[PDB]
Subunit: 310 residues, 5 copies
């Protein structure tokens, strides 16, 4: 039984995150638990403050007409429990539920360990005989407890784009709002646990430039090549199959090359030292010790700049 | 209370994907969240436009007769929430729910990293005293937001096969529709992460054709053989037990052979160099360096052609 | 309100699988989604075909007495949605639900990669003042779509044991039916992915019978011993802790022995070649090259026969 | 509306396991699915056998007063479906539900691979104006189908401790019953898969007592030390963080010592053989070959006895 | 229908844990199952003890006004079942539910294997026309069975902060209570399983200070470096991505350095022993054997003190 009116019924929205959690990098989802604030005028139930009852009248949801606000990007329907409906004399309604959804918002892994993200909760509403348009009220959208968790991320700001998006979808017009949760990753645990060890074993790897024993040089270079696949797989595991190239994706693949030519060199510093001309072998081996740790530190700047600097 | 009529009641369908996600290669499933559009004529509730009310009349689902449309290939029942029922004067109904199912459609891993797929949502409807036949209406089936995700895949087109399939199943006739979602995989992340490294360690492996030390030649060939099991298992892990042979399945097994004979050669370039006739050893070792990287590049064409070229 | 009668009320059953899936080897379960067909005579609602209505009368489940059929081997209760109840004039009821359960049926991993299985869905019904006995009607039990999936298995035949099992259980008699789903595994992907590689690395392993360098002989035999634990664990992982011995369980343990004595030999072809009598060392080493690949191929027949041949 | 009476209302209980499953070692839980039998006298509904109806009268649960029996050790509430309520003339009620809970009972991993366990389902009932006391009736508690699964365990006996435990808890008295499920583990698959291989690689490890090449002696002893961490982690993984010491916990740590001194010896059988006095080196190396496999077999008895023998 | 009164309605709370379990370190959650005790005065239902009925009157929840107590830090809504409502003559209510939630409380991994924690359950209540304030009653909050499990932790004490926290949140005042569960970890299983083995392989690692063979010195130092990544990953796995530095996080990274310079030394005790001046090589090698095991034991004190001592 919708509210008879002369024009577009405006419904004022507002979210208040109470709990964030389980941001699943692989899945590209996260779980929220917040307040939802709705508010419209339905003069059909204005009420003679003096003639009866008191200041405001409480209603069971079954009694009044209430606008269906569905979330757009959600897995299964949202999971809500109604907190208070309060009707004011002029015919103004004050709705308040407490929901918990798992929301589906893409991420940009282009700077993976150093990335920043911007999550979206959507909210549309479908119209009938009267057009409905949503809109943000900011005192009910300061939504964010001073206790919002989200392990592994720093939460920067929850806000909404005031102007809504009004498609026509299936011979009826809908109205959509944008709620943005801005977060940056907490990279750090990434250093002592992935970054440094990935370098350490790369340095060791090419300690075999101050060595002459092919045996201890393949035992050296190959054993590290393995420990680095150990890392490649570890990282390529808590990460989805992007169709672009990650930052940690490149410097992990670049490092596959500094193993290939490393193994080239040690193999050539050999079919050149069995060939009776070590004049050259321990001439190449000498350059390696310099061209390697430079071309690395040099390409890492090229790569680093390519991603963040640009 | 079904709609008394002279013939087969036709119910016009239409899906509109709003959200795709969680295509589980192992499981052979995916999760959809879309609009469902139904529409039939039930003259039993034609309504005297002028004598009362307005243009259309809204009903609660409890009030009218509504056709049960069940999905065929789904795990547990579909998970729906009703959006609007609108009855037009002639006795025409306009149904619209918003469901979320996890659908079960097979995939063809024959070209695994370079495969294309075609997912199915099915929709049957069981008849009673009057036969029901379904059918697609295409303005309600343009179903696909310009935001449909599906990580790891490019979505090519959502459509339906207009003619339905009319079995008789259990002393009553049913009618089935085919909705097709065409996708191709985003192979790429497969290259820097699986393909190239699988080659790199294969090349290194047979660097021991320019080497004479059995010790550094088994330390060479065997350590790579291991790093390749590391890859075999990684890949054979995000993939179900097909009864056919994958593409990546072959070139991963072919590569097991280029390790076996590699280890054969180095073992024969030895019980032939301890046997006082290295005339032959460093005669075989010489061919290897050519027959190997050719027979590979050559069989890879044979294999590649066998799968895609045919 | 049960159906007053002179004798055992017979209820005719029939299952029709629509979807099979998620056979969990570890868990020993699988998920089905089928039709359930019930049918009994309840003369209490015979109906004067001519005096009113039509051929058959449809009822809401709340209206009639319906027999509770529970599944015996299920995790939580079954998950059903009712499709049509049709009462015929003589007082005959025609029930039809569509359920989805996850069923719990043991498997026999005695021939693991080459096993055949026989799954069970059970169905009992508890009696009250009148005894209930179930029984199979085969036109409603041809249950199996021509599209039944079950990744990794070939489905051989769905059927039911016509005679039911009538216990007395808790001062009331119950009646149980046996529905059998016969499947054999699709072994294959097991070959290029587990079987062959397990052999390959075993052959390589004992390439060190044509080698004299303890160092390259321990680097040889030990590195493969490792790659085989890689396989042992991979396999012992998608498999439950049977109290019997798997086929792949034996030939994976037998192969642990052909590594132990391999390492024995190479260690004895040494404290016998440092002991100034290689007359014997390269006398033992010679036999190895024959006794090994024979005792293997020979025990594999003994083992293979022991399991399948018997 | 409780049953007015002169004294403690006695409610006769009885469980009948129908399905056991998913005993989660890590979690310390298991999932049951059984019958629950309640039975009390509520004279308030004695009923004149002759004056009306028949032998017994069936009731919907809404109609009579029924005692709330809650399980004590359960995760979320139990999950029940009511099977039959039967009231006898004297005013005796016969309740029967079929529930499925996941129960939380500790285990004793002190003999891990050879342990025996004793699971508990608890059952309390809270009193009001009349005291309630529970108690076991054994014909309704022979609860255990001849088909109870529980993969990996042998089920020894389901029983109940007849005397209940009557606390006063929160200004009201409660009554608690003990149902005991006695199981012992099926150790076996533990042998071919963990125990033997853990020994095999330990023997190999100290094959380097009949060897002189430090290189092949560190390649020998260290490569096995690794394969044993492979096992340590595998086992320490399907097991919770006990604050006591497991059996398999000790003999897995003892074995870490027979690697440490192994590596000590081979390192001392070297800074004593480069030290121009091998008189001693191949004097120590000789003892090792005996003190090792004895001190092992000897401590294993000490340890084995310490755990089981005591 | 709230209780008309002159002032802030006080509602007396009290929790009684019955079951603790599934403290998920990674997730930062735990699962509780306890009693909830509420109690307020609602004179509106005072009752003439003598004129009718008895001492106290039992009510169904539908009948009286009951205050909604929601938990603040919970995933989805709490999961409750009502145990008894008892109204006393003065108009005093006695509520008692039994709930099960999974609670979300942060942890402090700063001393990881030796940490102590303090979990929180929160409880707010929203006011309407009359202000509500909560408060703890301690005879109903002795909440903790003498059987509370929580595998892996010692439970120290369950208590509540008597003074509540009274925000104004969304044009209405709320009142919040603090329930604290104090636990310390059971570190131990951490020693035989992680700590000791991490040291053992570190000692072995630098056994190559009494060795001269680069080959057996890289085979020595590198093979252990690997076994330590085995441990790094094992530990970094049952632990969330803290933005601070764990204790076990440091001494696991410090140990990465005692591998780096270890590998430095052995590589320099070589390009100094091939350069014809071993005067220095076996001069450095000599210091190593002392500076290493001292700088370790020394920094471990610095680190240990830094974390616990401060």
């Amino acid at each position: 039984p919708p509210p008879i009116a002369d024009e577009p019924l405006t419904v004022n929205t507002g979210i208040y995150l109470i709990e964030c959690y389980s941001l699943d990098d692989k899945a590209e989802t996260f779980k929220v638990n917040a307040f939802l604030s709705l508010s419209w005028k339905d003069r059909r139930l204005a009420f003679d403050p003096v003639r009866s009852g008191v200041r405001v009248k409480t209603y069971e949801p079954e009694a009044i007409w209430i606008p269906e606000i569905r979330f757009v990007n959600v897995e299964n329907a949202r999971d809500a429990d109604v907190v208070d409906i309060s009707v004011s004399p002029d015919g103004t309604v004050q709705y308040l539920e407490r929901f918990s959804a798992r929301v589906l918002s893409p991420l940009d892994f282009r700077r993976y360990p150093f990335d920043s993200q911007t999550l979206h909760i959507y909210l549309i509403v479908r119209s009938v005989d009267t057009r409905n348009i949503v809109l943000a009220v900011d005192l009910e959208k300061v939504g964010k407890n001073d206790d919002v968790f989200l392990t592994g991320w720093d939460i920067e700001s929850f806000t909404a784009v005031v102007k809504p998006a009004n498609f026509a979808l299936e011979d009826r017009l809908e109205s959509k709002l944008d709620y943005q949760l801005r977060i940056s990753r907490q990279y750090f645990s990434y250093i002592p646990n992935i970054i440094l060890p990935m370098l350490f074993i790369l340095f060791i790897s090419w300690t075999a430039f101050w060595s002459t024993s092919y045996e201890a040089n393949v035992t050296l270079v190959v054993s590290t090549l393995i420990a680095h696949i150990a890392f490649n797989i570890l990282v390529e595991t808590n990460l989805p199959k992007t169709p672009y190239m990650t930052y940690t994706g490149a410097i992990i693949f670049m490092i596959y090359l500094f193993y290939f030519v490393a193994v080239i060199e040690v193999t050539v510093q050999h079919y050149l030292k069995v060939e009776s001309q070590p004049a050259r072998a321990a001439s190449i081996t000498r350059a390696s010790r310099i061209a390697f740790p430079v071309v690395f530190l040099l390409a890492n700047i090229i790569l680093a700049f390519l991603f963040f600097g640009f």
